[PDB]
Design an enzyme around this catalytic site. Structure first.
Site, PDB file in Angstrom:
ATOM      1  CD  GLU A  36      53.258  75.390  84.574  1.00  0.00           C
ATOM      2  OE1 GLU A  36      52.174  76.074  84.528  1.00  0.00           O
ATOM      3  OE2 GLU A  36      53.695  74.692  83.616  1.00  0.00           O
ATOM      4  CG  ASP A  54      53.926  70.535  73.744  1.00  0.00           C
ATOM      5  OD1 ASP A  54      54.919  70.569  72.963  1.00  0.00           O
ATOM      6  OD2 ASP A  54      53.740  71.358  74.717  1.00  0.00           O
TER       7      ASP A  54
END
Length: 258
Positions: A36, A54
């Site tokens: 991550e 995003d």
């Protein structure tokens, strides 16, 4: 000291509800954090807050809770703020109460949390919660409701209780979603067969995950393949319990992220 990475209430909560202690959860979080954030230092993400562009709004905390947007219409960020209100002692916990406690200008717009504060102001307010045990507790309560409870239930119904199985499942759920489509933890489990032997079942699980882990932007190849290999390799290293596993975890996470 790894337990400085929790709070006493979080440790009790995780022990009662998962069977795992702070060492085991610290190890799971190092392993999740590698793919991550390309670091084993997950603790510094309690106060993390960024809009990464995003269209999911702001990404918050250790498991990437989102406030919501055009590509995230069912976000778990509102749940996190409502859990923070609850942890703070609210009689009638709400998203609005959790926001109110840290002075955030924002409201629910349907399913989405719309923040009126600037990125700079909002991110600064969340950063101040890095060492706030009430916030750490809301973070883990949210992580539990959205990902860990399902992961633990799925391990336990099979007679699998190991730290490594639970963390393998939680990583899958976090990365790919807990339930829903064929790529979720639920989906992968549905294709993982019926072996009653934990190591055997998990070998098949890893193989089935690996078929989709670099698709659908779960990960960028070959980061998803390496991500799954982390979990699979710990079996033959004798680390099913994720205890006394610091060197093993450094070894399996030593891959270069593309």
């Amino acid at each position: 000291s790894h337990d400085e990475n929790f709070s006493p209430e979080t440790l009790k909560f995780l022990r009662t509800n998962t069977g795992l202690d702070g060492e085991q959860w610290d190890n799971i979080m190092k392993l999740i954090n590698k793919p991550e954030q390309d670091s084993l230092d997950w603790t510094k993400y309690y106060g993390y807050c960024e809009d990464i562009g995003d269209d999911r709004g702001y990404t918050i905390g250790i498991f990437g809770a989102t406030t919501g947007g055009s590509n995230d219409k069912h976000p778990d960020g509102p749940t996190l703020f409502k859990e923070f209100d609850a942890a703070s002692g609210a009689a009638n916990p709400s998203v609005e109460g959790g926001l109110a406690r840290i002075g955030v200008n924002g409201s629910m717009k349907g399913s989405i949390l719309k923040i009126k504060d600037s990125e700079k102001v909002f991110c600064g307010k969340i950063k101040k919660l890095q060492n706030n045990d009430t916030w750490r507790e809301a973070i883990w309560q949210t992580f539990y409701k959205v990902y860990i409870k399902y992961s633990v239930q799925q391990a336990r119904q099979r007679g699998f209780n190991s730290a490594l199985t639970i963390g393998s499942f939680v990583d899958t759920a976090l990365n790919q979603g807990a339930t829903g489509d064929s790529g979720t933890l639920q989906g992968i489990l549905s294709r993982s067969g019926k072996s009653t032997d934990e190591k055997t079942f998990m070998k098949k699980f890893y193989a089935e995950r690996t078929l989709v882990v670099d698709t659908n932007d779960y990960n960028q190849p070959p980061n998803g393949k390496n991500r799954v290999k982390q979990w699979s390799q710990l079996w033959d290293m004798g680390k099913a319990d994720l205890k006394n596993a610091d060197d093993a975890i450094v070894k399996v996470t030593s891959w270069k992220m593309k």
